[PDB]
Amino acid sequence: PHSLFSTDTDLTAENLLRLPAEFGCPVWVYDAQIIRRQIAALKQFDVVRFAQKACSNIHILRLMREQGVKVDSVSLGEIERALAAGYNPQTHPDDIVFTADVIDQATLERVSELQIPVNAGSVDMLDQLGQVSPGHRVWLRVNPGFGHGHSQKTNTGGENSKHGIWYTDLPAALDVIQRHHLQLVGIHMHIGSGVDYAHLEQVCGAMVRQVIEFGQDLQAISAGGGLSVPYQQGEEAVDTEHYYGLWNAAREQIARHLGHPVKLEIEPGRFLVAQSGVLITQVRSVKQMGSRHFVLVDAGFNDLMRPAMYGSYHHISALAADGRSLEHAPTVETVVAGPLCESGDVFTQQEGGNVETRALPEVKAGDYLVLHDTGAYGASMSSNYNSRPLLPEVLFDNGQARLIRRRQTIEELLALELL
Amino acid sequence: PHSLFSTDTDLTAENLLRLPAEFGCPVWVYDAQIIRRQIAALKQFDVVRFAQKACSNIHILRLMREQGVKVDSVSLGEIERALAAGYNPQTHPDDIVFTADVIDQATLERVSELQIPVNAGSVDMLDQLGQVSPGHRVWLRVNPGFGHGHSQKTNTGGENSKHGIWYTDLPAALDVIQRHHLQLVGIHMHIGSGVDYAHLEQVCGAMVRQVIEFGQDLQAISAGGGLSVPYQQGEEAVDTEHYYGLWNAAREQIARHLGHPVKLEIEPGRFLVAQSGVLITQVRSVKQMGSRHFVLVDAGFNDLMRPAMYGSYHHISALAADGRSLEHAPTVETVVAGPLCESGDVFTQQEGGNVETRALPEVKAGDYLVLHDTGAYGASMSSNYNSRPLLPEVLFDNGQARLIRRRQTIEELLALELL
Ligand SMILES: *Cc1c(COP(=O)(O)O)cnc(C)c1O
Numbered sequence: 001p002h003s004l005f006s007t008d009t010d011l012t013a014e015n016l017l018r019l020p021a022e023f024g025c026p027v028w029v030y031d032a033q034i035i036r037r038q039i040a041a042l043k044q045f046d047v048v049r050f051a052q053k054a055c056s057n058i059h060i061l062r063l064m065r066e067q068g069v070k071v072d073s074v075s076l077g078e079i080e081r082a083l084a085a086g087y088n089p090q091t092h093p094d095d096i097v098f099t100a101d102v103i104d105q106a107t108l109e110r111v112s113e114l115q116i117p118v119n120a121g122s123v124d125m126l127d128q129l130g131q132v133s134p135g136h137r138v139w140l141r142v143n144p145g146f147g148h149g150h151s152q153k154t155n156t157g158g159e160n161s162k163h164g165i166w167y168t169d170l171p172a173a174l175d176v177i178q179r180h181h182l183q184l185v186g187i188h189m190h191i192g193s194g195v196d197y198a199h200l201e202q203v204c205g206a207m208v209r210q211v212i213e214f215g216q217d218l219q220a221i222s223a224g225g226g227l228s229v230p231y232q233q234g235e236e237a238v239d240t241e242h243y244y245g246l247w248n249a250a251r252e253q254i255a256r257h258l259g260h261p262v263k264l265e266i267e268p269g270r271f272l273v274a275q276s277g278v279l280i281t282q283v284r285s286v287k288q289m290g291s292r293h294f295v296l297v298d299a300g301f302n303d304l305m306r307p308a309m310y311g312s313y314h315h316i317s318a319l320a321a322d323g324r325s326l327e328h329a330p331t332v333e334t335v336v337a338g339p340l341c342e343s344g345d346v347f348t349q350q351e352g353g354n355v356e357t358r359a360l361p362e363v364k365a366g367d368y369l370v371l372h373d374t375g376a377y378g379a380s381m382s383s384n385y386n387s388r389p390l391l392p393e394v395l396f397d398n399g400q401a402r403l404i405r406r407r408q409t410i411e412e413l414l415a416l417e418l419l
Numbered sequence: 420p421h422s423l424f425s426t427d428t429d430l431t432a433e434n435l436l437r438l439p440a441e442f443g444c445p446v447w448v449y450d451a452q453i454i455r456r457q458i459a460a461l462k463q464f465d466v467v468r469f470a471q472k473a474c475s476n477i478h479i480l481r482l483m484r485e486q487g488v489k490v491d492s493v494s495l496g497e498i499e500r501a502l503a504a505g506y507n508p509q510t511h512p513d514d515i516v517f518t519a520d521v522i523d524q525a526t527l528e529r530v531s532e533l534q535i536p537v538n539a540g541s542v543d544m545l546d547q548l549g550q551v552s553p554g555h556r557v558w559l560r561v562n563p564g565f566g567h568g569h570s571q572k573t574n575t576g577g578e579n580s581k582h583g584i585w586y587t588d589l590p591a592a593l594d595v596i597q598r599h600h601l602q603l604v605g606i607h608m609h610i611g612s613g614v615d616y617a618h619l620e621q622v623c624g625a626m627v628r629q630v631i632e633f634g635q636d637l638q639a640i641s642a643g644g645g646l647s648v649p650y651q652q653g654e655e656a657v658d659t660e661h662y663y664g665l666w667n668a669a670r671e672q673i674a675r676h677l678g679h680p681v682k683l684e685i686e687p688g689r690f691l692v693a694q695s696g697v698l699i700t701q702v703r704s705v706k707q708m709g710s711r712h713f714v715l716v717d718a719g720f721n722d723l724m725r726p727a728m729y730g731s732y733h734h735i736s737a738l739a740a741d742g743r744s745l746e747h748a749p750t751v752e753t754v755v756a757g758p759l760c761e762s763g764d765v766f767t768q769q770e771g772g773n774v775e776t777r778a779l780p781e782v783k784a785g786d787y788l789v790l791h792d793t794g795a796y797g798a799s800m801s802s803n804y805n806s807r808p809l810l811p812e813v814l815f816d817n818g819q820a821r822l823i824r825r826r827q828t829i830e831e832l833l834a835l836e837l838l
Pocket residue numbers: 051053054072074099190192224225226227267268269270271376760761
């Protein structure tokens with residue numbers, strides 16, 4: 001992550017300390033210039049299609065669109081978000097793609113009505129779309145027979161994944177395409193390689209193989225997402241030129257097979273937005289539990305779910321309430337936890353649930369903690385567990401912080417029940 | 420769980436098949452008479468205080484109150500929910516207790532204003548309350564030095580838990596009580612024993628020991644929650660008389676020490692409400708992935724989080740769309756998964772993430788699946804991940820189904836961003 005004192009960005013110690021007083025706490029903060037920087041790193045690709053499930057605020061989608069980035073929707077709600085951010089299927093038919101393994105009635109009606117291209121991840125879904133919208137423009141998401149990581153576990157590919165059309169089911173997919181006269185626009189894979197370039201080349205090689213074997217004309221291919229970001233000190237950042245090298249080479253073999261140019265999309269979520277965001281939360285209780293030193297804040301797993309759900313590491317900094325630097329202060333092994341009435345509400349824990357400590361300055365109630373690199377799958381995963389409201393979101397653009405989401409209210413949630 | 424054909428309750432195969440057509444899908448369904456039955460099983464206790472974080476709908480809180488059950492709030496949102504359900508601190512001061520390890524400014528103002536008794540789980544929180552509301556009526560949540568289950572992991576007790584005042588910090592708690600003239604109402608523990616009666620007796624014994632050592636007068640003690648329910652075929656249900664035997668014995672030793680009657684609360688969440696609820700979801704895509712048979716529905720981990728988060732088992736039944744019984748139909752080992760664009764969106768997985776199968780009738784798109792025993796920590800944990808809206812909730816009371824929560828809308832979530 002970034003240092004709050006080194007800061008070239010707007011995410012400095014001084015800027016962050018003042019935010020809670022103005023906008024409330026806890027609160028999500030993003031730096032627009034960090035998103036623009038991530039977008040620029042993928043300028044070689046023909047299309048950068050943001051996976052908006054990583055960070056869906058409509059103002060951040062507007063910023064993507066401003067920069068020429070298109071958008072992937074995985075639900076009806078995300079379609080409406082893309083439309084509110086100014087994407088427009090009537091004038092630009094490929095600015096929104098609807099991607100999923102399933103499609104429901106309302107979404108079928110919406111994609112048919114607006115003619116939003118559909119990336120189908122199951123043969124059934126392709127058939128349901130085709131039956132109500134003959135000749136629809138589609139993509140095929142293919143599961144190439146393998147995923148990433150432990151392969152017994154829930155996966156983005158392989159047999160223990162729900163995602164995409166199994167590669168040997170392609171002929172049946174073609175029958176459905178032919179039955180409803182569907183128009184094949186492209187073939188897509190989303191597996192995710194991070195910085196494992198050998199794995200990435202297997203995905204690239206599988207796309208070439210499968211596209212060529214399928215033997216259908218198409219206009220584009222997609223590399224999917226899965227670019228990693230270094231959440232921890234010293235980890236390696238993605239080399240985008242290397243990603244481009246490998247996927248462009250795959251696109252070129254395909255284009256040569258087809259006898260015409262083939263567009264190349266990349267569909268990052270995390271890479272574009274993770275490092276741009278932080279979460280500011282106030283220390284409320286500090287206590288000793290046997291040999292553990294506990295620091296409890298006012299944000300919990302309903303706000304940032306990653307650590308509780310996956311054991312995700314997020315760098316943590318402390319900000320003194322009075323503003324004195326804690327840059328060189330002595331540290332104490334600290335367990336950081338939330339306000340929820342649930343045992344799993346601990347930000348410093350490993351995959352599997354083991355509690356762990358973090359070297360941190362010795363804060364007191366009133367001080368703040370900053371959780372770094374929460375731009376991706378932070379606010380987007382939030383829940384209302386413990387009847388806690390969606391937090392406010394703030395966007396920095398060259399020194400100026402602006403509210404891009406107001407705090408949700410308990411009244412708005414009760415309105416659902418006061419019928 | 421219950422059989423959809425054996426059904427004495429309203430949760431039958433016929434009743435459930437019709438619900439989605441009337442109220443939408445997916446949808447949470449509860450049977451009021453099952454909650455009343457669970458409440459009746461704890462009639463020996465002086466007070467049954469519902470942990471509303473297990474199932475917070477205000478109509479279900481109203482039903483609790485109707486039955487003489489009081490309520491525990493763990494956030495400001497839950498306080499407002501209790502007030503909307505008709506609980507009233509002005510006339511009945513102990514009908515709502517605010518319980519947590521942390522307290523924020525807005526909650527401090529609300530509990531001071533309404534004089535809602537506070538169950539403090541950190542010395543800092545007790546001090547913050549006392550400073551703004553001298554003489555407030557409080558409980559002390561004590562961590563007795565041990566939890567339940569793997570003790571390296573995030574816990575309800577022990578040193579790897581954020582919950583409650585460490586038992587050796589009691590003297591400091593007393594200093595704070597004395598400084599602000601706080602009025603000690605009771606002492607509480609929430610560890611959770613399920614059907615492990617030997618562990619339960621350790622908790623009971625710790626409460627006696629700690630209350631007597633602390634040496635302060637009080638009016639009540641609480642056993643906390645943690646009564647288990649048998650999610651799987653053949654598991655053992657709680658013996659409430661056994662729970663009462665052990666806690667009443669602890670209450671009696673304490674009452675004898677104090678020289679006057681001491682009230683006994685129990686604070687169940689899951690036990691009261693889990694088996695009363697189901698989740699109905701439609702099959703949308705059925706596919707073969709290598710050697711796995713996948714059945715994807717329209718509800719996902721944002722709706723029911725348990726399996727993805729913990730590997731929780733929830734019984735699954737299938738309902739044919741045309742209504743023919745699938746009671747004796749042949750089964751196929753099936754992996755059941757959701758619509759989300761996330762690999763972890765699989766309902767049939769073990770703790771740790773391993774995909775597993777479930778013997779189920781061979782459904783097709785259009786058929787429905789029922790997830791059993793989702794009354795507790797189902798709707799209450801829901802999120803808006805993938806821009807998916809909170810689901811509708813339906814309450815059965817003697818054969819009649821009524822809407823107790825309308826489906827949230829994407830417009831209501833966008834209203835937070837259209838400033
Ligand atoms: C989540 C998702 C992505 C984004 O994945 P990241 O790791 O955030 O880049 C891209 N494409 C699809 C189809 C997805 O579901």
